[PDB]
Design a binder for these strands. Sequence first.
DNA 1: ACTGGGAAATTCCAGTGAT
DNA 2: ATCACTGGAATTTCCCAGT
Lengths: 275, 275
Amino acid sequence: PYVEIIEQPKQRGMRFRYKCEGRSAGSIPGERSTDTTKTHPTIKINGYTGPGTVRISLVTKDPPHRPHPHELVGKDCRDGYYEADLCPDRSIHSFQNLGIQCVKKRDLEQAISQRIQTNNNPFHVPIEEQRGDYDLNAVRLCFQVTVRDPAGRPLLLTPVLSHPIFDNRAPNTAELKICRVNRNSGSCLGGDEIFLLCDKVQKEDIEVYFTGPGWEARGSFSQADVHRQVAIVFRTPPYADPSLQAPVRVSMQLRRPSDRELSEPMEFQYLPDTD
Amino acid sequence: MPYVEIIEQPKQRGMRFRYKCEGRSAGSIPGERSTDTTKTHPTIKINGYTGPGTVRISLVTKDPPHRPHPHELVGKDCRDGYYEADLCPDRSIHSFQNLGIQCVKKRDLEQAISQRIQTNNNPFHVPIEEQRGDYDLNAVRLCFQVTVRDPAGRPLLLTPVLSHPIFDNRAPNTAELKICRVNRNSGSCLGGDEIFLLCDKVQKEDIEVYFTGPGWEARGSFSQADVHRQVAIVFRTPPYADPSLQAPVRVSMQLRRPSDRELSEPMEFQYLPDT
DNA sequence: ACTGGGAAATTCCAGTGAT
DNA sequence: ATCACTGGAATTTCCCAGT
């Protein structure tokens, strides 16, 4: 038998909580979770239905896939991992209260030691590897299901990794959001100056991205024009057609080149430049 | 009575207090009239003496019961949070080029006060039962304590002299106010024009934009919600003194912190006549 | 009793200006 | 070149509001 992830966790928008915040972290939602309806990380076991248990732990994003210093917290969690029974009737199982508690950099070595001491090492990575640098802003869930064989001995199935889950404090992997913009129309000739207030971006890895049917342009600005990661002063690009007869609605959004993430689109109208 | 005179006061705003983690030495406090082309430093002159002696500089509280401050002076010839070196015998004027302010953590406050007492760092001999009230960690004063010699070489302790207060640039509340950028620097004399203004960090509960002319005083209109991550303000210009303005008039526009009434450099704004 | 989010407090660090 | 220093950014802690 083997495990497949039916509903991946949502990658973005989750805030890892420190222990100093004595409140337990949130509940990780599934990809397709919408503000209306709430999905949850969900797996399915193909090749077996009946009594079993599941352990979920955090491992690193990048390929050694060693146990992450962060902890799962929530119901049925201890020593930074979740563990509980599967339903024997169903072959689909969901996890409604998985929270991520980030540990501090100074408490790293202690955290790693606990992973080893608690035998929380799904891919049995040697301790040699586990003195590499960790990305504390990204984790993967690791599903480790145990079923019964025909004799009723526990059978451990291959661990499956989720997609990465990113801390939304991390600007390099956060959601892009335009909060306020001082102007939403401009000359088709381009070069109109726009003040745009946004959520935290990295000035070396952000652009303003105008799009239409089979068209794209970028607003002009330097890294100096990005103010304290939360504002961009830029000039609009010229529109494809230099002699518009009438206004033309296009979309304006933030774009992060590194991972090609886009923000929610906003309406911008290029106007005919007849003075 | 030989006495100490402050030739060059310390510049009050601009400089950060540094934590121990940021390293040994915390920069050099500059003089009032320090510029990029001519860097000045705090300077005293000893009137009515020449020859060998000592000078101690320590930090004291801004407010009248001048107790020793929990923060430390660090740099050349500093120990136990105070500066102490031999007075130059030849010259009567003395300046200090490596004074840095090292701020202590809130956690280590009671320990720091205990060090001040243990080291006999109490220039105004304040009783210990005053050394427990609230300290303003955002502001200190330099205390210059000069010891000269009488003709037989016995120490004569001159009166302690206080500097102007020095404020932590990094601390919100005490940071220097600055208008970095603005989308428009003109508009109707009636008001109601929307300005996107980019600024250094301000507290939205303790900030306002201040229009001033000769015998006029007005404020831009905005809510706390319009302060975006402490470094941008979207506001509406107030009405000019005279709504029957014939031809343009230039006013000053600056950030003001009501709590302590501090201001930014002024930025020109011109009220235009309404068409 | 728990949740969403802003900001103060502390730490880190890339790129300078003084030498 | 070195490295003290400058100022932006990242990390960690604290706190408010609302159900």
